[PDB]
Scaffold this motif. Sequence first.
Motif, mmCIF file in Angstrom:
data_model
loop_
_atom_site.group_PDB
_atom_site.id
_atom_site.type_symbol
_atom_site.label_atom_id
_atom_site.label_comp_id
_atom_site.label_asym_id
_atom_site.label_seq_id
_atom_site.Cartn_x
_atom_site.Cartn_y
_atom_site.Cartn_z
ATOM 1 N N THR B 3 10.612 -25.314 -1.416
ATOM 2 C CA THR B 3 10.584 -24.214 -2.281
ATOM 3 C C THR B 3 9.590 -23.227 -1.863
ATOM 4 O O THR B 3 8.682 -23.647 -1.023
ATOM 5 N N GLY B 4 9.380 -22.139 -2.608
ATOM 6 C CA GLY B 4 8.240 -21.089 -2.129
ATOM 7 C C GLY B 4 8.328 -20.627 -1.090
ATOM 8 O O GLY B 4 9.536 -20.267 -0.516
ATOM 9 N N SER B 5 7.274 -20.065 -0.392
ATOM 10 C CA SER B 5 7.340 -19.481 1.149
ATOM 11 C C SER B 5 6.980 -20.324 1.960
ATOM 12 O O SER B 5 6.005 -21.111 2.429
ATOM 13 N N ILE B 6 8.336 -20.558 2.898
ATOM 14 C CA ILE B 6 8.150 -21.337 3.805
ATOM 15 C C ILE B 6 8.469 -20.461 5.407
ATOM 16 O O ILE B 6 9.108 -19.461 5.244
ATOM 17 N N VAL B 7 7.373 -20.719 6.210
ATOM 18 C CA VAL B 7 7.320 -19.896 7.324
ATOM 19 C C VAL B 7 8.075 -20.180 8.545
ATOM 20 O O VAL B 7 8.207 -21.526 8.915
ATOM 21 N N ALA B 8 8.842 -19.476 9.216
ATOM 22 C CA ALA B 8 9.782 -19.642 10.337
ATOM 23 C C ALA B 8 8.639 -19.246 11.510
ATOM 24 O O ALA B 8 8.530 -17.988 11.894
ATOM 25 N N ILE B 9 7.729 -20.212 11.999
ATOM 26 C CA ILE B 9 6.608 -19.993 12.583
ATOM 27 C C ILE B 9 6.733 -19.556 13.990
ATOM 28 O O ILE B 9 7.732 -20.305 14.779
ATOM 29 N N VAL B 10 6.347 -18.649 14.710
ATOM 30 C CA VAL B 10 6.587 -18.257 16.019
ATOM 31 C C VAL B 10 5.897 -19.519 17.045
ATOM 32 O O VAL B 10 5.126 -20.476 16.357
ATOM 33 N N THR B 11 6.188 -19.633 18.120
ATOM 34 C CA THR B 11 5.622 -20.722 19.269
ATOM 35 C C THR B 11 4.769 -19.925 20.015
ATOM 36 O O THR B 11 5.342 -19.302 20.841
ATOM 37 N N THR B 36 0.821 -21.362 2.029
ATOM 38 C CA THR B 36 2.176 -21.451 2.579
ATOM 39 C C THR B 36 2.776 -22.760 2.268
ATOM 40 O O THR B 36 2.081 -23.955 2.348
ATOM 41 N N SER B 37 4.064 -22.996 1.945
ATOM 42 C CA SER B 37 4.768 -24.282 1.531
ATOM 43 C C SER B 37 5.206 -25.279 2.410
ATOM 44 O O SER B 37 4.887 -26.508 2.094
ATOM 45 N N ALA B 38 5.595 -24.824 3.602
ATOM 46 C CA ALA B 38 6.118 -25.694 4.581
ATOM 47 C C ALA B 38 6.336 -24.646 5.858
ATOM 48 O O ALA B 38 6.293 -23.825 5.721
ATOM 49 N N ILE B 39 6.248 -25.587 7.188
ATOM 50 C CA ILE B 39 6.596 -24.918 8.179
ATOM 51 C C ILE B 39 8.013 -25.242 8.897
ATOM 52 O O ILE B 39 8.424 -26.356 8.841
ATOM 53 N N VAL B 40 8.914 -24.316 9.348
ATOM 54 C CA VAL B 40 9.891 -24.490 10.171
ATOM 55 C C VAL B 40 9.426 -24.467 11.387
ATOM 56 O O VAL B 40 9.075 -23.276 12.099
ATOM 57 N N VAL B 42 10.048 -24.392 15.718
ATOM 58 C CA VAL B 42 11.331 -24.161 16.708
ATOM 59 C C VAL B 42 12.572 -23.584 16.165
ATOM 60 O O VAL B 42 13.486 -24.163 16.396
ATOM 61 N N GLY B 43 12.627 -22.711 15.105
ATOM 62 C CA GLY B 43 13.650 -22.084 14.769
ATOM 63 C C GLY B 43 13.912 -21.069 15.509
ATOM 64 O O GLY B 43 13.279 -20.816 16.493
ATOM 65 N N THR B 44 14.679 -20.206 15.308
ATOM 66 C CA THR B 44 14.889 -18.774 15.897
ATOM 67 C C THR B 44 13.792 -18.230 16.373
ATOM 68 O O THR B 44 13.534 -17.790 17.560
ATOM 69 N N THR B 45 12.849 -17.757 15.350
ATOM 70 C CA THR B 45 11.313 -16.962 15.366
ATOM 71 C C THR B 45 10.500 -17.944 16.228
ATOM 72 O O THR B 45 9.905 -17.346 16.991
ATOM 73 N N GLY B 46 10.772 -19.225 16.445
ATOM 74 C CA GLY B 46 9.913 -19.824 17.276
ATOM 75 C C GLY B 46 10.686 -20.192 18.527
ATOM 76 O O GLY B 46 10.193 -21.172 19.508
ATOM 77 N N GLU B 47 11.593 -19.335 18.808
ATOM 78 C CA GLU B 47 12.300 -19.251 20.324
ATOM 79 C C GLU B 47 13.037 -20.650 20.715
ATOM 80 O O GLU B 47 12.838 -20.944 21.772
ATOM 81 N N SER B 48 13.934 -21.342 19.754
ATOM 82 C CA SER B 48 14.663 -22.353 19.926
ATOM 83 C C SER B 48 15.634 -21.933 21.276
ATOM 84 O O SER B 48 15.808 -22.886 21.995
ATOM 85 N N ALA B 49 16.101 -20.922 21.449
ATOM 86 C CA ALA B 49 16.859 -20.374 22.434
ATOM 87 C C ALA B 49 16.124 -20.508 23.982
ATOM 88 O O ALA B 49 17.032 -20.943 24.795
ATOM 89 N N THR B 50 14.904 -20.429 24.090
ATOM 90 C CA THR B 50 14.581 -20.411 25.425
ATOM 91 C C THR B 50 13.721 -21.490 25.804
ATOM 92 O O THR B 50 13.036 -21.744 26.956
ATOM 93 N N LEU B 51 13.744 -22.609 25.038
ATOM 94 C CA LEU B 51 12.877 -23.916 25.228
ATOM 95 C C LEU B 51 13.899 -24.858 25.454
ATOM 96 O O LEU B 51 14.820 -24.830 24.883
ATOM 97 N N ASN B 52 13.686 -25.886 26.262
ATOM 98 C CA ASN B 52 14.616 -26.686 26.439
ATOM 99 C C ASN B 52 14.298 -28.000 25.447
ATOM 100 O O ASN B 52 13.308 -27.907 24.690
ATOM 101 N N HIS B 53 15.290 -28.841 25.533
ATOM 102 C CA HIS B 53 14.848 -29.865 24.274
ATOM 103 C C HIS B 53 13.888 -30.607 24.371
ATOM 104 O O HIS B 53 13.111 -30.940 23.132
ATOM 105 N N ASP B 54 13.286 -30.803 25.236
ATOM 106 C CA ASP B 54 11.949 -31.730 25.736
ATOM 107 C C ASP B 54 10.788 -30.641 25.158
ATOM 108 O O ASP B 54 9.856 -31.201 24.352
#
Lengths: 292, 292
Positions: B3-11, B36-40, B42-54
């Motif tokens: 709940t509250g403000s959860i950041v989609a954090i940049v990488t 801030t209540s929690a961190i997401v 490597v979502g979209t804002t964290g560039e999940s698209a351009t990072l490999n899985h490792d």
Amino acid sequence: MFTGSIVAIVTPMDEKGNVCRASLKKLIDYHVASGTSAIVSVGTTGESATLNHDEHADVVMMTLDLADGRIPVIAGTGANATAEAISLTQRFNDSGIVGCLTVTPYYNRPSQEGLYQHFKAIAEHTDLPQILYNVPSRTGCDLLPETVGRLAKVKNIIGIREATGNLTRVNQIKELVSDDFVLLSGDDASALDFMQLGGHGVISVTANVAARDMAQMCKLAAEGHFAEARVINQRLMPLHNKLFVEPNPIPVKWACKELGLVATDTLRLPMTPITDSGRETVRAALKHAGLL
Amino acid sequence: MFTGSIVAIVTPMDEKGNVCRASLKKLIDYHVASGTSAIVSVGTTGESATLNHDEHADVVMMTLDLADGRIPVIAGTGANATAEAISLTQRFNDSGIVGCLTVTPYYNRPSQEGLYQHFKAIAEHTDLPQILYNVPSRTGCDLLPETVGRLAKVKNIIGIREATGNLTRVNQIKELVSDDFVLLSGDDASALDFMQLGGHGVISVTANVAARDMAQMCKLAAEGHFAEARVINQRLMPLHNKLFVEPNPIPVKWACKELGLVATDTLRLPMTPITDSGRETVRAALKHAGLL
Ligand SMILES: [Cl-]
Ligand SMILES: [Cl-]
Ligand SMILES: [K+]
Ligand SMILES: [K+]
Ligand SMILES: [K+]
Ligand SMILES: [K+]
């Protein structure tokens, strides 16, 4: 060969979701015999999304091996990371493919400048011809004519598969590019209109099951015999629509199985088996087309 | 915490495009201090698209270490192939993350049934709480309330990040789920409205650079002090909008650098450096928020 009827080929799978060589051989013999201009291997319709890069490469190599020089092969090489697209292109250099089909990055929605730099860098690191692929309904971004015009100046960017279904794009692109730049429809239902407006062919889902009719329609269109081509297009039109009654490639794999072209209609999750109602719709379209 | 403000954090990256540890620690300390209540991670804002899985796993693990139990960390785990999503999820099993944020398959456009089977299977291969993520403008598909209701019956599917910007979804989903199912906005510009309708918080891009205001606004909102939260929102509204003047996370990364929160605004292709006109736009929005 980058004109006429080009098939966006399914990747046939056994019950366990593994590539079926015997069904693939059959598909390839079918396109050689039916006059398909080229095969696009492991594009969207070939379930690029759910094969890892090893399987992706395996399918393309197997396709070339089975083709045995009888039909040109184009590999799907698209990725939403530029480094990934580049790396995937390198896998296919000197493989024997004649070109690459490369989609606008999906999900991350880059700007026009970013699409420019994306495709410029891919083209920079290979000698293989590159066909751009715009399909905004899948990717969430739209490669506009202006930017297509910029990318066409790059030596080995040779064409575009245009899947907006927006036919005003044909001449907006054509007037910005040289006459050897290839314009290919990526929307079966509007492909003949696309060719009538100046398009040179189609990268086709329908060609999976109506290869001869598609090949002839594309040749008539190229010769300017649009009324003749339209008679064929009219009989294929339900197929053009109903092959998307459920998410592509669910209907087309089922159709291939129904015609006995492949052993099973299995796909990988998140694709799921065709519903009874979809079977009914697609079978009716196949009959309208005179294939059953 | 969900709940509250959860950041989609940049990488944050160095000039080579690799994760910048000093910048990440600074960001995480910032979010700890700001409420801030929690961190997401490597979502979209964290560039999940351009990072490999490792690389993606590396960032999540580093974020968790740096958080050092002070603030809950949620892993971005989205993939358009079900097998791939399961595999990525398993990397984080028994790791210390409190949950996963998992997007609807992008590009391949599965059916509602396909979406159900995708998320059901992911949930079955983990004990981690799952937050569904719907953002049709990026993915080309739309997870309808009816299917959310169906998935909410799965034990460890616990909430949804709803990013359509279509506020009617809040009560459509609410009436089909149990009262502990979490509804979170994924559209900063409409997030207060979303909370006013019964939403429980926001997974926010704006929170990257206005964490304290965002935390206070969600707190006021949860208390039902909407008039008072709205004053904060009006101050932040130009950021809610202008952080998308160029493709996310191009503006917010620049904003972070400008605020001295990260060392560089470097991103991976196909994301490109912010334009000069974009710099001026984001700078005025920061100033309007009273942060510059
Ligand atoms: Cl395709
Ligand atoms: Cl995000
Ligand atoms: K080159
Ligand atoms: K060219
Ligand atoms: K990735
Ligand atoms: K549940």
